[PDB]
Amino acid sequence: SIGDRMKRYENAYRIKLPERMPVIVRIDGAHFHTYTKGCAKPFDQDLAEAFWETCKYLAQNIMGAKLVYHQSDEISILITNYDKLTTQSWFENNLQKIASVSASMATAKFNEVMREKYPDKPLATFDGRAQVLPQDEVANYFIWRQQDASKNSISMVAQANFPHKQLQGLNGKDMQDKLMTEKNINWNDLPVWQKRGICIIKESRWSVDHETPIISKDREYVEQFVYL
Amino acid sequence: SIGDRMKRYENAYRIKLPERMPVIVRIDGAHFHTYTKGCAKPFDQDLAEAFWETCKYLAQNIMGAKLVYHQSDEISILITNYDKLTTQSWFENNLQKIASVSASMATAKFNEVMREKYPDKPLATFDGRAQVLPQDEVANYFIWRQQDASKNSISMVAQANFPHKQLLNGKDMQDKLMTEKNINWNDLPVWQKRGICIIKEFYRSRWSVDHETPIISKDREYVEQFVYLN
Amino acid sequence: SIGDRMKRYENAYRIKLPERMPVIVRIDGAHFHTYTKGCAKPFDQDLAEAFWETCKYLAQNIMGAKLVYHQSDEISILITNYDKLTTQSWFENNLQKIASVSASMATAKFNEVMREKYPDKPLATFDGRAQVLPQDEVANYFIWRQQDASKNSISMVAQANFPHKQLLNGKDMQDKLMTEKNINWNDLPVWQKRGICIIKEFYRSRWSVDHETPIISKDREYVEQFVYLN
Amino acid sequence: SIGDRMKRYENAYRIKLPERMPVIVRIDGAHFHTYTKGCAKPFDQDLAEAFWETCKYLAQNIMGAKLVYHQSDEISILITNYDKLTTQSWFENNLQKIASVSASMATAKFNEVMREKYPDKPLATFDGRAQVLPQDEVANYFIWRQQDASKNSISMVAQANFPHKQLQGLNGKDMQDKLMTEKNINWNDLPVWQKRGICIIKESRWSVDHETPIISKDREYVEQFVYL
Ligand SMILES: Nc1ncnc2c1ncn2[C@@H]1O[C@H](COP(=O)(O)OP(=O)(O)OP(=O)(O)O)[C@@H](O)[C@H]1O
Ligand SMILES: Nc1ncnc2c1ncn2[C@@H]1O[C@H](COP(=O)(O)OP(=O)(O)OP(=O)(O)O)[C@@H](O)[C@H]1O
Ligand SMILES: Nc1ncnc2c1ncn2[C@@H]1O[C@H](COP(=O)(O)OP(=O)(O)OP(=O)(O)O)[C@@H](O)[C@H]1O
Ligand SMILES: Nc1ncnc2c1ncn2[C@@H]1O[C@H](COP(=O)(O)OP(=O)(O)OP(=O)(O)O)[C@@H](O)[C@H]1O
Ligand SMILES: [Mg+2]
Ligand SMILES: [Mg+2]
Ligand SMILES: [Mg+2]
Ligand SMILES: [Mg+2]
Ligand SMILES: [Mg+2]
Ligand SMILES: [Mg+2]
Ligand SMILES: [Mg+2]
Ligand SMILES: [Mg+2]
């Protein structure tokens, strides 16, 4: 049967993630150097709030979603499927389905919210990737993402205040000190989301936590959704 | 370090399709029974033309895109990456990236166009899946899709005329429409009966809707022209 | 170059299991209905002890091997790679390498031992498959294997006494042996009823056959002792 | 059901190769620097013939097998599954099954044949890996394998005739010329299998082709099994 051959051709890449373990989905903006060209540098409040609305929308429509992290143009989602013995998985842990629909959901909401304040902004697109993590690595994943957040934060602030040559090639600590003595800018005084991104947590409703801690010194902020 | 460790967890599902062979991407609307609940049944011209604009947008932005086929709420895209010896692959044939970005692109264009005439419509979403096919199965793929197009076409038309209980198979609902309701399915336009394709047309070049899209099973070269280069 | 191109085709199926989580490898004899056709039915002591020596050989040569379970012609191996923070993975958790080398090792030892007493026996072959499991499913895996061990055990014994047509389920063939043939299944030794495990025993250390291997469903710590390190 | 969960856990890595395209399996000896320590250097006739018997055994028991190539301690097998419209695949193109059983079959036959001439030789083990290739790349695969064969051949001959220091760091052409003027060894005069390995072809029976050509100048030697 032709339908039977095609079904096998399709099933050859019908990958499913193993169940009963943490699933991480990351959604990233495509060509967001071009897309955010024109936005307020180094940090656009309107753009960030559009991401946060997307994070909420994501957390609301994803089965098993427990925690959403945002920084720059990326969105990380922690998904668990082992709350109960009879807990089901989003799309039955189908890899291509989890990744594509997440990117779809993000795309739909982000473009809607952005074009409310910017009706002539070009279309925004996103990619999506899913994976699994052991329980003792979930907190580490977000710690990894927060460290990348701080590294990019400092660079973005130093880029919007100095020519490229000056920064080359300068450490994070250097650009931080140069921001202080030369521009009266104390990086530490910036709001949390600009320094290390923020998390969206269910409080029920999904809301932004502007007091999102440094996860490396408060791992339970993440692990409370990991070990149940 | 921690980043090295994290990089390996991610790479465990960094799947890549083997290169130099036909790639098929299918995009299907999520819960389009609810989303279309309010559209013109059995066939909505506004909704269909929103997919057609989406189909163009996809073909214009996908490296190696040769043909797009639309039917109902699904979009199949034929991608080839062996035109030359130096032909590169879209996202280097990364599985999760090809599927998601395709769904993202489809989502962006579709929602944009649909807002114009239907700003009250909720957000439309899509899923995406990618795969490879041997050269002598590409035509058979679209033939398989057209056969799924016709079976859905007859059911959609019949379910828009008769009651739920009153309606049997495809050959039954076809003559049930001819006799009982005096409606001829074979008289319907091409895109309603077996869907249509989107092909680059030359004049400069542009992606266009071909309403003279043939039955692939009776014209296999229509697809195979993009499958066999040399 | 050509090698770069070839390297990518191969890497399309260079699959790796995610690290820092339980790995299970199962090895199953190929066509062991024919290979064992000539052995002592229902249970052959020589054949079983050849698997036990194979099970030892596997555990001795597999990085992170914690427990091996034998039953019939299958061999399940529990591998952990998270003992320390610096624990490395066998073949870096390469799927095709873990499965094939396991099957190769099993093939080498088994054929060697079996030749000794049965040099007329044809070559024995095995397949191999690897996977991961969450920590709270490892015990459940072996429990699942022991439940498949008992159902096979009763059938093997019954099929060795009665005619093909004469034999119903497990509870039926169990009392059909007690009444009709006066044979008690529950009186049989452990390895025949529910298989056995191979665990490292301390005295120096060595892998040994534990004939006092309990029913895992009634003693989960027997397995979980290797699953949860801290 | 516990059996249903486990089945899903196992199916998470039940990978199948897409059908109706060339499948390549490569089997490689594990630790064959240690295993062949004691064998005749640079080329052991007995060891090579043991490989050839394995290649035959492989070609006889693998559904769809068309061509087997051997060099050093590796075995490459070309498998096709599109001879007819109703052609089936070995193990239904199950990846882990094709790779493991191939390595199993090789292991069984190789150890049997070797221990006929060397009953006290340690056990030999092998790994196995499978993949797909487009039709216009199959000939190139073996060309790639033959080029690696010649590269290793020259090095092995130069290693068994000179100390390590001398070779460092010398081209293939250099070691070839040094073999000539300094040891009266013309590499080109060596038998085919020592220079670039050989193929096992069905002639029916599977037999060694000691006249196996340089595939880069006779691609039809391979492509005759590719395009049918
Ligand atoms: N709040 C913000 N305001 C202004 N710009 C931002 C903001 N957040 C992120 N950006 C911009 O988004 C970009 C992120 O780039 P990234 O490294 O993700 O690659 P990209 O430009 O998105 O392209 P690709 O994702 O295809 O590699 C940065 O250049 C940064 O300037
Ligand atoms: N031109 C059109 N006009 C109106 N409705 C349409 C049109 N094309 C497709 N539809 C509707 O789209 C639906 C497609 O349903 P499908 O089988 O794809 O499942 P779904 O409802 O999309 O949910 P899911 O995709 O999650 O399975 C049909 O019910 C059909 O009524
Ligand atoms: N101790 C033993 N003595 C005799 N025979 C045994 C023993 N253990 C297992 N067997 C035999 O091994 C066979 C196992 O069959 P299994 O269900 O694994 O399929 P198979 O015959 O191995 O073929 P395949 O593995 O290709 O499916 C049984 O038929 C059983 O008779
Ligand atoms: N005919 C032969 N005679 C003597 N030695 C041989 C012969 N064929 C192959 N060898 C030896 O086999 C070895 C092949 O090594 P290879 O690069 O495959 O790694 P390996 O030693 O097999 O270990 P691993 O496969 O685990 O990396 C060479 O060192 C070579 O000396
Ligand atoms: Mg980006
Ligand atoms: Mg980014
Ligand atoms: Mg749909
Ligand atoms: Mg659909
Ligand atoms: Mg078996
Ligand atoms: Mg079995
Ligand atoms: Mg080797
Ligand atoms: Mg080798």
CA distance D147 to chain C (A): 10
CB of C28 closer than 8 Å to CB of C171: no
- Candidates A28, A32, A192: which one to mutate for ligand 1, based on the most atoms within 8 Å of Cβ? A32
D196 sits in which H/E element = helix D192-196
Q: Assign residue B158 a region: left if phi > 0, alpha if psi is -120 to 50, beta otherwise? A: alpha
φ/ψ (deg, to 5) at A20: 55, 40
A119/C130 Cα distance (integer angstroms): 52
Domain count, chain D: 1
CB of B101 closer than 8 Å to CB of B90: no
Per-residue burial over C154-189, b if 16 or more Cβ lie within 10 Å, else e, is: bbebbeebbeeeeeeeeeebbebbeeeeebebeebe
CA distance B20 to chain C (A): 10
**Cβ atoms within 10 Å of D222's Cβ, excluding its own:** 21
C53/C46 Cα distance (integer angstroms): 11
* Nearest to A35, CA basis, from A47, A26, A45, A25: A47
* Nearest to A23, CA basis, from B13, D15, C80: B13
Output the CA B73–ligand 2 centroid distance in Å: 5
User: If DSSP codes are grouped into helix, strand and coil, which group holds residue A132?
Assistant: strand
CB of B104 closer than 8 Å to CB of A107: yes
Beta bridge partner(s), residue B199: B208
A106/A54 Cα distance (integer angstroms): 6
CA A166 to chain centre: 30
Task: Specify the length of chain A in residues.
Answer: 228
Beta bridge partner(s), residue D37: D39
Tell me how far CA of residue B111 lies from CA of A36, A112, D22, in angstroms: 21, 9, 42
B138 sits in which H/E element = helix B138-158
* Nearest to D48, CA basis, from D222, D200, D158: D200
Sequence-ordered strand ranges (E) for chain B: 23-29, 65-71, 74-79, 126-132, 196-202, 205-210
Q: Tell me which residues of chain D, numbers 36 to 95, contact chain B at a CB-CB cutoff of 8 Å.
A: 82
DSSP code at position C164: T
**Ligand number with the minimum distance to the CA of D43:** 4
C164/C160 Cα distance (integer angstroms): 9
Amino acid residing at B51: F
Q: Which two tokens stand for residue D203?
A: 């002639």
Say which residue the tokens 């992290």 belong to: A69
| Burial class of residue D196, CB neighbours in 10 A (0-12, 13-18, 19+) | buried
CB of D131 closer than 8 Å to CB of D124: no
CB of D47 closer than 8 Å to CB of D113: no
C196 sits in which H/E element = strand C196-202
* Nearest to A199, CA basis, from A213, A216, A181, A218: A213
CA B43 to chain centre: 16
Omega into D163 within 30° of 0, i.e. cis? no
User: If DSSP codes are grouped into helix, strand and coil, which group holds residue A88?
Assistant: coil
CA distance A42 to chain B (A): 25
D155/D145 Cα distance (integer angstroms): 16
D113/D96 Cα distance (integer angstroms): 26
Range of the domain at A32: 1-228
CATH of the domain at C129: 3.30.70.3000
Pocket of ligand 4 (CB under 6 A): D 28-33, 36, 39, 41, 43-44, 47-48, 72-73
CB of B75 closer than 8 Å to CB of B55: yes
**Cβ atoms within 10 Å of B57's Cβ, excluding its own:** 20
Helix locations, A76-183, DSSP H = 95-117, 138-159, 164-167, 172-183
* Nearest to B69, CA basis, from B217, B228, B187, B216: B216
Q: Which of C103, C124, C144 sits opposite D2 (nearest CB)?
A: C144
DSSP code at position B183: -
* Nearest to D79, CA basis, from D28, D127, D27, D124: D27
Beta strands A65-71 and D74-79, pairing class: unpaired
CB of B186 closer than 8 Å to CB of B167: no
B198/B206 Cα distance (integer angstroms): 10
**Cβ atoms within 10 Å of D188's Cβ, excluding its own:** 7
Sequence-ordered strand ranges (E) for A2-125: 23-29, 65-71, 74-79
Angle between helices B45-61 and B95-117 (to 10 degrees): 140
* Nearest to D54, CA basis, from D130, D111, D98, D124: D111
φ/ψ (deg, to 5) at D104: -65, -55
Which residues touch C220 (CB under 8 Å, ≥6 apart)?
A: C139, C143
Resolution in A: 2.4
CB of B60 closer than 8 Å to CB of A134: no
Pocket of ligand 1 (CB under 6 A): A 28-33, 36, 39, 41, 43-44, 47-48, 72-73
C127 sits in which H/E element = strand C126-132
Which residues touch D129 (CB under 8 Å, ≥6 apart)?
A: C10, C13, C96, C97, C100, D25, D26, D99
Give every strand in the sheet of C74-79, ordered side by side: C126-132, C23-29, C74-79, C65-71, C196-202, C205-210
Q: How was this structure determined?
A: X-ray
What Rg, from alpha-carbon coordinates, does chain C have?
A: 20
* Nearest to A140, CA basis, from A78, A54, A64, A86: A78
Which residues touch B142 (CB under 8 Å, ≥6 apart)?
A: B67, B69, B76, B78, B197, B216, B223
Q: Which atom of ligand 3 is nearest to the CA of C73?
A: 9
Which of D31, D104, D141 is the best substitution to test chain C (most C C-beta atoms within 10 A)? D104
DSSP code at position C42: S
* Nearest to B128, CA basis, from A129, A77, D15, A57: A129
φ/ψ (deg, to 5) at B71: -165, 130
CB contact under 8 A, A144 and B105: no
